[PDB]
Design a protein around this nucleic acid. Sequence first.
RNA 1: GAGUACGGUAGAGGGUGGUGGAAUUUCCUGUGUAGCGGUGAAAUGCGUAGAUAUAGGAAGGAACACCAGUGGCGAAGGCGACCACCUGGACUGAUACUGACACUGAGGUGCGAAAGCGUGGGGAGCAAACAGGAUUAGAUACCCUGGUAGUCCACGCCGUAAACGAUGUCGACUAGCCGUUGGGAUCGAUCUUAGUGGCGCAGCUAACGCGAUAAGUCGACCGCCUGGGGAGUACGGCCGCAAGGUUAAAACUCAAAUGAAUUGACGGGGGCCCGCACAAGCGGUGGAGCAUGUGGUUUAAUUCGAAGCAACGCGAAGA
Lengths: 119, 152, 62
Amino acid sequence: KVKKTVVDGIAHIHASFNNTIVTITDRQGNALSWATSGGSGFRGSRKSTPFAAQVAAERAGQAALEYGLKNLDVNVKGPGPGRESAVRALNACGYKIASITDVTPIPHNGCRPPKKRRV
Amino acid sequence: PRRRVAAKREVLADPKYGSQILAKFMNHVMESGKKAVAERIVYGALDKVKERGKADPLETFEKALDAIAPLVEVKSRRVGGATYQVPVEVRPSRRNALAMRWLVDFARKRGEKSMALRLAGELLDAAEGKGAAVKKREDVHRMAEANKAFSH
Amino acid sequence: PAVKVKENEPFDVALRRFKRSCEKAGVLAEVRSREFYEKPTAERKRKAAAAVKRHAKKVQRE
RNA sequence: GAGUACGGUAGAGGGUGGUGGAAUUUCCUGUGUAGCGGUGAAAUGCGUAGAUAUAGGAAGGAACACCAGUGGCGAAGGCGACCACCUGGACUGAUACUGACACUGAGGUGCGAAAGCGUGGGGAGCAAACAGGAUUAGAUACCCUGGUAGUCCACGCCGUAAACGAUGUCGACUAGCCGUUGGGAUCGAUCUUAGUGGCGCAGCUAACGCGAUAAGUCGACCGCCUGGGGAGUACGGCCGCAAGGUUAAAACUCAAAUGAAUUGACGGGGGCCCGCACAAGCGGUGGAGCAUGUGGUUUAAUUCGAAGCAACGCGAAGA
Ligand SMILES: [Mg+2]
Ligand SMILES: [Mg+2]
Ligand SMILES: [Mg+2]
Ligand SMILES: [Mg+2]
Ligand SMILES: [Mg+2]
Ligand SMILES: [Mg+2]
Ligand SMILES: [Mg+2]
Ligand SMILES: [Mg+2]
Ligand SMILES: [Mg+2]
Ligand SMILES: [Mg+2]
Ligand SMILES: [Mg+2]
Ligand SMILES: [Mg+2]
Ligand SMILES: [Mg+2]
Ligand SMILES: [Mg+2]
Ligand SMILES: [Mg+2]
Ligand SMILES: [Mg+2]
Ligand SMILES: [Mg+2]
Ligand SMILES: [Mg+2]
Ligand SMILES: [Mg+2]
Ligand SMILES: [Mg+2]
Ligand SMILES: [Mg+2]
Ligand SMILES: [Mg+2]
Ligand SMILES: [Mg+2]
Ligand SMILES: [Mg+2]
Ligand SMILES: [Mg+2]
Ligand SMILES: [Mg+2]
Ligand SMILES: [Mg+2]
């Protein structure tokens, strides 16, 4: 309930094949607001669509206007849909996007992945 | 059809109001080729409309028609395990046809004395958004906007 | 893969430029590859088939 | 022909140590609040005992993105991070040297994927067995959430694979064209040498197809086959700690089993096209009463025929 101001946030879009999670933080990685496709009330096949990601980003941005945050940098991560609709929702929330960076983690050899589904 | 060769016909002859839309409405209320009976029913309903109050009956007619044509329609499509329901905008010609079909069908089942009275009651009630047809339109609209995810 | 918004351009060229940069980097391809495990037999078979098709593609030009 | 000495090249060839960066997992801490994860749809599962997300830190193990390629190296199996050390072979050029010193090879000896086994370490991910949730008529399966042997290391055993080019090794001849890897000569082009690929004349083949990397024309040596099952099984021997390997029959039974290609048909294979086939609509049948045909039952007889669509108001346009 106590107030704290903060400018120049960073928005992380975490997009998978099933969901998307948008989290706005400060420079130090302290989360202020977050939202998700499932939290928006989609819950299923509708959860894996750019519309759900756009709504999630809208909610997260509206929550984040409380602290100020005139500026956001963007970190996209993941192969799923909602990858770009989240960003174009975030700007329409009113922020000033300085840059976009892709931070998808790629192993160089890494652990072996699961076996292939026989569908 | 596959060939896309259907050509639309031109038979539209409103006798004494000279209104293009009322002829199609009478075609919709017609049953089994009896043009005269439907003619009489529609004119009686419009007389009731003009004598309840000061509104021009024809103007009340297109005001109800505007207040009842849906804007978007839900189309079913099976995607391989579940049948989803996409929204799509309704063509301008389909709006009026859907409006008349709904209006007539819901006036069929009201329960007053004569069919003309049923139609008059439906026009009066739907002219401001209180009939069964208007709430069906609202049901279709909410069903369409609850599936906005697919849309495209 | 990263971009910036520089000298007051709309947020409709920066996003497309970012998409092009990510496609050039090869992010989605890498993720789709590590989605599941491909046994060495299947990898070698795929390389052989791709090489055959590449050679046929080159030859058919003349 | 086959070897030696001398410069010089290219290489995931082999062994022993050391060290890197990306990522996953667990653990500690800060912010933060109701979901996360998964699916065709779910549910199990994880979360308000504060999860997923996000930022900082630590521990450990395994695999080595891009380069990467009809590319390279090795007798084969096989071998991809970087560095040092030990070490095998191939290619290439000039001169000199030995003087047939060669090829093949039953026994025999050695190397030999993965799984498996013994003793001792290790434990991130994945995952036989196992448990739960779905799906289903059932589902000891596919699918989801977990998860132990094993996968990793050292030493020892095992000795098998569609261990395949389904093509034994060595040598000599027989039109060409187009790529590529290591390397020489001549004036980017030409020639030449050892590999690695795509077409193709003769010739060969049952055909498919092979075609200087022959399945063509020849020579030297070796291994193997003799209709399909029974059966690569039984018994005996030899190996193995075990699993099992290897060598290897018969009675009986059948008149076929088979290879390549051809015509059609079919496909929960592909591409184009069509039809009240769907879609968008209007009126109905299945419910009631009656008419009428049929099945079944009954009767002395209920006269014969029509039986998915393509029989049943049909032969019958008149019991
Ligand atoms: Mg999975
Ligand atoms: Mg975390
Ligand atoms: Mg021998
Ligand atoms: Mg092993
Ligand atoms: Mg073992
Ligand atoms: Mg065992
Ligand atoms: Mg052990
Ligand atoms: Mg697991
Ligand atoms: Mg062991
Ligand atoms: Mg064998
Ligand atoms: Mg092999
Ligand atoms: Mg063989
Ligand atoms: Mg030969
Ligand atoms: Mg030869
Ligand atoms: Mg050829
Ligand atoms: Mg032959
Ligand atoms: Mg026999
Ligand atoms: Mg045996
Ligand atoms: Mg055997
Ligand atoms: Mg024996
Ligand atoms: Mg044992
Ligand atoms: Mg055949
Ligand atoms: Mg239909
Ligand atoms: Mg009946
Ligand atoms: Mg009936
Ligand atoms: Mg009869
Ligand atoms: Mg008939």
